[PDB]
Design a protein around this ligand. Structure first.
Ligand SMILES: CO[C@]1(C(=O)O)C[C@H](OC(C)=O)[C@@H](NC(C)=O)[C@H]([C@H](O)[C@H](O)CO)O1
Ligand SMILES: CO[C@]1(C(=O)O)C[C@H](OC(C)=O)[C@@H](NC(C)=O)[C@H]([C@H](O)[C@H](O)CO)O1
Ligand SMILES: CO[C@]1(C(=O)O)C[C@H](OC(C)=O)[C@@H](NC(C)=O)[C@H]([C@H](O)[C@H](O)CO)O1
Ligand SMILES: [Cl-]
Ligand SMILES: [Zn+2]
Ligand SMILES: [Zn+2]
Ligand SMILES: [Zn+2]
Ligand SMILES: [Zn+2]
Ligand SMILES: [Zn+2]
Lengths: 172, 185, 186
């Protein structure tokens, strides 16, 4: 009970636009008052599988949400499936984003956001932005939201990313 | 009583003096993971010269610095920009009740990051990151963190915030950035 | 002390790494085990040889180099790594423990997360990109590309590829520091 994670393989665990179209790899490790997080994404099918902004310039972003109840347990309306989220060998308030650092919705402060850049197919001229926001969803006690977005014109690029590390302040 | 975390608390009460007294909230969390300190930082400027950036009027106002200076016991010195009242080991969402006496285990390692008297200054005592003003992706600013480069102290962490875009009425309140550094002991 | 949770190069400036000439650089690498994740901190000081002072007006083709750490099934550094074995060990104070370690599997990159090379589809999650700055100057970026388990002739590997695209003129290759993490094998 120091790491909460998805399994590290590439089997689909996540639904963005159609069922089980993606594999989110998310590893949360509790280092006392901070959670060390490591994230990457493979889209395996559907709308976001192959990006072509030549033919669809307005398809530029999508969102994966993780919603948690008051005990830190993943809710079923999350994009990530509950069967795929477990401690490495179910309550987990110590992994939740701190509500004083990152308050629930209602102008708020930007420190509840972390930005990073990952790269599609591992190619250094294929950046995409991963925007991570804490506790800004409703209908839950805690949340972590990943928004993936890009501004370059990609032409038939498969959406599979390099890895990004961040941290956040833990609820307890 | 989390003896592995030194922090500012996560509230929004100003705790830092950049240009005028208590004009900002520096949120800084230092978590000891053995030989490395995991650090998380953000800044909210609430008043004064840096609260609203307008480079149309003053195109030369493009940076400022926040210094944390520590003595030989790792205790924050009063000439730091960060106030001492707010800086302590964590208890819940607040601080432990009494001011700490020793925190050498959280200081930047002096062999990795030597004092300015050193023969050679090495760039490894610097970490660069980018944060975003108002959380907007087209409002980057650079946070440059430097270890042990101040004088008049045993240890120091310096944050320099700067930007190169011409911002017009942009409030200086940032997204969060994580880094680490090698601990003294 | 005797810090079993840190595998490192020590933090001194003694050259320990061979890029183009023997012991022409100091790779400062600290691997700190936080359970299932390794917290990693890296920087590079080149002190001699062809990558010490970059001048792309005179040498326009010098734009990248790679430092490889290769490990066996026990997580022991192999002798054909760029990093010397004498310098790589568990931590004691600001130095290393006295005897060379025999097992460090808990610090190796996870083989399920970062599979070895094959003929099947290769996925990007075994790469982390960062930007560091030469001489600490904000207008002298270089890219550090870290790749897990993509070398052959080993059980595990961490490789650091350094590259840049600006035309630098007499710039000393000493980098700022970069932190990343990766999923541990055990
Ligand atoms: C032109 O600007 C970019 C680009 O191609 O979009 C920015 C990008 O960095 C970001 C943060 O997106 C950078 N890639 C990395 C991994 O740093 C590349 C790279 O330097 C060159 O393409 C040469 O490989 O240059
Ligand atoms: C033009 O270059 C920048 C910019 O606006 O200054 C660079 C910036 O990245 C850095 C490291 O400053 C990047 N923001 C993020 C969050 O990565 C934005 C963003 O891609 C576009 O604005 C589209 O939203 O583009
Ligand atoms: C022009 O674009 C760059 C550059 O000079 O190459 C990109 C570089 O960022 C990257 C990720 O390479 C950035 N440096 C930092 C530390 O963010 C500098 C900086 O903003 C200005 O030079 C002002 O000092 O601008
Ligand atoms: Cl695919
Ligand atoms: Zn396909
Ligand atoms: Zn205001
Ligand atoms: Zn405001
Ligand atoms: Zn220590
Ligand atoms: Zn030199």
């Amino acid at each position: 009970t120091r790491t909460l994670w998805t399994t590290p393989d590439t089997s689909p665990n996540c639904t963005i636009a159609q069922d089980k179209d993606s594999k989110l790899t998310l590893v949360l490790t509790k280092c006392g008052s901070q959670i060390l997080a490591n994230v990457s994404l493979i889209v395996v099918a559907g709308k976001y599988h192959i990006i072509n902004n030549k033919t669809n310039p307005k398809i530029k972003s999508f969102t994966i949400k993780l919603l948690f109840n008051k005990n830190g347990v993943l809710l079923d309306n999350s994009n990530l499936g509950k069967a795929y989220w477990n401690f490495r060998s179910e309550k987990a308030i110590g992994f939740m984003p701190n509500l004083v650092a990152y308050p629930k919705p209602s102008k708020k402060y930007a420190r509840d956001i972390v930005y990073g850049t990952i790269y599609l197919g591992g190619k250094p001229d294929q950046p995409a932005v991963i925007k991570t926001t804490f506790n800004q969803e409703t209908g839950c006690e805690y949340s972590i939201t990943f928004n993936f977005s890009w501004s370059k014109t990609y032409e038939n690029v498969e959406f599979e990313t390099t890895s990004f590390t961040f941290s956040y302040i833990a609820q307890e």
